[PDB]
Amino acid sequence: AHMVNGKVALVTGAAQGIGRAFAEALLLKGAKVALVDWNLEAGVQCKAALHEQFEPQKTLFIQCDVADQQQLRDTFRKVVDHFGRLDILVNNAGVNNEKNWEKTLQINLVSVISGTYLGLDYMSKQNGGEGGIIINMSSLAGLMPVAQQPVYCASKHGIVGFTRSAALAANLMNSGVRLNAICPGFVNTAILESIEKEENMGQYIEYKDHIKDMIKYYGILDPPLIANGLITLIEDDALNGAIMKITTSKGIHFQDYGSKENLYFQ
Amino acid sequence: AHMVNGKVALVTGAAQGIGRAFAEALLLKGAKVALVDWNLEAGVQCKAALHEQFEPQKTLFIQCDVADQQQLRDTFRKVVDHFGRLDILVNNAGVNNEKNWEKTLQINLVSVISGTYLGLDYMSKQNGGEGGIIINMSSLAGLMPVAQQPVYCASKHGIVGFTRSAALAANLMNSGVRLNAICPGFVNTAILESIEKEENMGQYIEYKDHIKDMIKYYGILDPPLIANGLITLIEDDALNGAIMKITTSKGIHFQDYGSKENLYFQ
Ligand SMILES: NC(=O)c1ccc[n+]([C@@H]2O[C@H](COP(=O)([O-])OP(=O)(O)OC[C@H]3O[C@@H](n4cnc5c(N)ncnc54)[C@H](O)[C@@H]3O)[C@@H](O)[C@H]2O)c1
Ligand SMILES: NC(=O)c1ccc[n+]([C@@H]2O[C@H](COP(=O)([O-])OP(=O)(O)OC[C@H]3O[C@@H](n4cnc5c(N)ncnc54)[C@H](O)[C@@H]3O)[C@@H](O)[C@H]2O)c1
C-alpha cells in the first residue's frame, strides 16, 4: 500500500460538503492539502477552522472557478510552487442545475477533464513528475438514469467513460498516474437541497418527489464515508480505472465490468 | 408499428456518412427529410444528388453549426415552417478530435442535448405537438472505454445517460416523445480516417495502432446497416430509452439493463 502521509493533495470544491470531508480525511492522514473553491468566504473560513485541528502549514486555500481554464492552470501552478509537488488530484467540484444546464456540463464534466489533464501535465513520469493519483467525482447518476436530472446524469456518465479511458491511456503511456472515480448514492450536502428549487430543477421541478421518495427509502450517507472511499483509492496501488460505488446498502464496492474487455464487439 | 411514410425527419450531420445513410433510408420509406449540416458544399451536393432518386419536395437542406445555439433554434423553426410539422429528430452530427476536445464535447454532447430539447419544444404533446421520436447517435464508446479517445468516449457516455434519463422524463410528462440512442461498432466513414491524424488524436496519436488492430479484427459496418437500426427504432412504438447496439457480431441488438431499476442502490 501507498502511505498518504506527506503527499500533496489538490481538492477542488473543498470549501464544503464532500470536498471538505476529503480535505479533513487527507489532513488527518498526514497529507498537505490545497483547498480549491470558487466560494471565497466559505473557502477562507474552512482553512481558518482547520487551523484548530491541523498545523496551518498543512493547508493552502486558492479561490478558483474550475470552469475558467486560465484560472485553473494558474491554480495548479500556485499549488506546485507552494508545496513543491503534487501527488493527489481530486476533481470534486460539481453542481446540480438542469435550468442552466450548459454551465452544469462546463463545471461537472469539462472542468473534470481540464483538471485531469493539468494533473497529468504535472504528475506524469513522462512530463518530469513521479506519478500520482487523480480521483474524479461521479455519482450513481454516472451509471444509471435520473429522470429529473438528465444533464447531471449526462455529466456523471461522461466522467465514468472519461476516467476508465484515461486510466487505460495512463498504462499505455507509463505515466505512473492512476485515475479512478467515485460513484456515491445520496449524501448529506447542499447539492441534495437543490432538488427543491425551480432555479435548479427547471422543467423537472414538478417531478422532484420521485427523488425525495428515493432518499427516504435508501437513506443518506455521511460525507466522511465518502472520504473513506477516497483514502482507499489512494492507498491501494492496484486500483486504476476503478469505478468505486458507495451506498447505504453495500458501503464501498466496485462496478464490475467483467474480464472480457471487448465484450461488446463479440 | 408506426409507419414512416409521410413523417417529417430532421437529420443533423446529414451531408455524409451515417447521416446521409439515414436521410436515404428515410426517403426510401416515404419520409420528408430536412438535411442539416455545417458543410455547405457537401450539403447542397447531397440534396442535388438525392433529386435523382426522390422528388425534390421530399428534401430541404439547411446549413447549421449545431453547436451554435441560435443557429440551431433558427434551423428547427425553418424546418417546421417548411414542412408544417416535425416527427423524427436524429441528432447525428459528431466529430473525433482529442486535441480540440472542448469543441468535441460542444458538438458531440452539448448539441445533442440542445437539439433534443428543441425537439421536445416542438414535438411534446404538452407544447402543442403530437409526440414523435428523438434518436441520439452514441457509439460502443458510450458503453466501454476507448484508451485513445477519452473525450470522445466521455461525450458518448454522456449521450447514453442523457437519453435514458430524458426517456423516463418523457413518460412522466406524457410528452408522447420516445427517446432512444444507437451505439454502433466501427462504420466506414470520415470519422474512422481521423484516427490517423495528430490534428485529431493529439497526445493519443502514438497509440492509434491499437484502434487499427481492433478495426482489422472486428470488421467495419456499412452505413445502411446503421440506418436499418434507425428505422427499427422509429417503427417500434414500444422502444423508449432503448440503447441499441449494432455490431458485425450480433447485428442490431440492445443493451440490457435488467428488470431492477434501482439495482445499484440495493
Ligand atoms: N451530495 C450528493 O448526494 C452527491 C452524490 C453523488 C455525487 N456527488 C458529487 O459530489 C461532488 C461534491 O458535491 P457536494 O455534494 O459536496 O456539493 P456541495 O454543493 O456541498 O459542494 C460543492 C463544492 O464545490 C464548489 N464548486 C461548485 N462549482 C464550482 C466551480 N465552478 N469552481 C470551484 N468550485 C466550485 C462549491 O462552492 C462547493 O464548495 C459533486 O461533484 C457532486 O456531483 C454528490
Ligand atoms: N463512423 C463510426 O465508426 C462511428 C461509430 C459509432 C458512432 N458514430 C457516430 O456517428 C455519427 C455520424 O458520424 P459519421 O461516422 O457519419 O462521421 P462523418 O464525419 O462521416 O459525418 C459527420 C457529419 O456531421 C457533420 N458535422 C460535424 N460537426 C457538425 C456541426 N458542428 N454542425 C453541423 N454538422 C456537423 C459533418 O459535416 C458530416 O457531414 C457521429 O455522432 C459519430 O460519433 C460513428
Could you tell me the strand order of the sheet in which A32-37 lies? A59-63, A32-37, A8-12, A88-91, A132-137, A177-184, A243-247, A251-254
Structural domains in chain B (count): 1
B162 with A153: Cβ contact below 8 A: yes
Any chain B CB within 8 A of the CB of A207? yes
Instruction: Using DSSP, state whether B36 is helix, strand or coil.
Output: strand
Burial class (CB in 10 A: 0-12, 13-18, 19+), B257: middle
Resolution of the determined structure in angstroms stands at 1.6
CA distance A248 to B147: 32
CA distance B26 to A221: 49
* Elucidation method: X-ray
Residue length of chain B: 266
CA distances from A176 to A81, A129, A266, B203 (A): 21, 9, 31, 16
CA distance A69 to B183: 32
Query: Residue B226 in contact with residue B187, Cβ under 8 Å?
Result: yes
How close is the Cα of B159 to the center of ligand 2, in Å?
A: 14
Query: Residue B204 in contact with residue B149, Cβ under 8 Å?
Result: yes
> A17 in ligand 1 pocket by Cβ < 6 Å?
yes
Catalytic residue annotation of B: 152
Residue B95 CA to its chain's centroid (Å): 12
Instruction: Give CB contacts under 8 A, 24+ apart, made by B51-57.
Output: B53/B24, B53/B27, B54/B27, B57/B32
**Which residues of chain A form beta strands (DSSP E)?**
8-12, 32-37, 59-63, 88-91, 132-137, 177-184, 243-247, 251-254
- Give chain B's largest Cα–Cα span: 57
Q: Domain range holding A69? A: 1-266
Residue A4 CA to its chain's centroid (Å): 17
Of A140, A156, A266, which is closest to B249 when you measure between CB atoms? A266
Any chain A CB within 8 A of the CB of B118? no
A150 with B161: Cβ contact below 8 A: yes
First to last CA, chain B: 36
What are the residues facing A137 on neighbouring strands?
Answer: A182
* C-alpha cell belonging to residue A57: 502549514
Q: What angle do CA B215, B216, B219 make, to 5 degrees?
A: 65
Residue of B nearest to A105 (CA): B110
Which of these, A122, A239, A243, A131, lies nearest to A181 by C-alpha position? A243
CA distance B36 to B79: 10
> B60 in ligand 2 pocket by Cβ < 6 Å?
no
CA distance B140 to B157: 9
Give me the residue label for grid cell 417531478. Answer: A207
A109 with B160: Cβ contact below 8 A: no
Query: Residue A162 in contact with residue A119, Cβ under 8 Å?
Result: no
Q: Which of residues 164-193 of B touch A (CB under 8 A)?
A: 164-169, 171-172, 185
Q: Taken in order A43, A133, A110, A185, is the CA torsion positive or negative? A: negative
Q: What is the CA radius of gyration of chain B?
A: 18
Flag whether B14 is marked binding: yes
Query: Residue B7 in contact with residue B87, Cβ under 8 Å?
Result: yes
Alpha helices in B38-149 (DSSP H): 40-50, 69-83, 101-105, 111-123
Identify the CATH number of the domain in which residue A86 sits: 3.40.50.720
Give me the residue label for grid cell 481492433. Answer: B214
Burial class (CB in 10 A: 0-12, 13-18, 19+), B41: exposed
What are the residues facing A9 on neighbouring strands?
Answer: A33, A88
Burial class (CB in 10 A: 0-12, 13-18, 19+), B148: buried
- Non-local CB neighbours of A237 within 8 Å, separated by 6+ positions: A1, A2, A178
Ligand 1: which of A18, A20, A66, A221 to mutate, most ligand atoms within 8 Å of CB?
A18
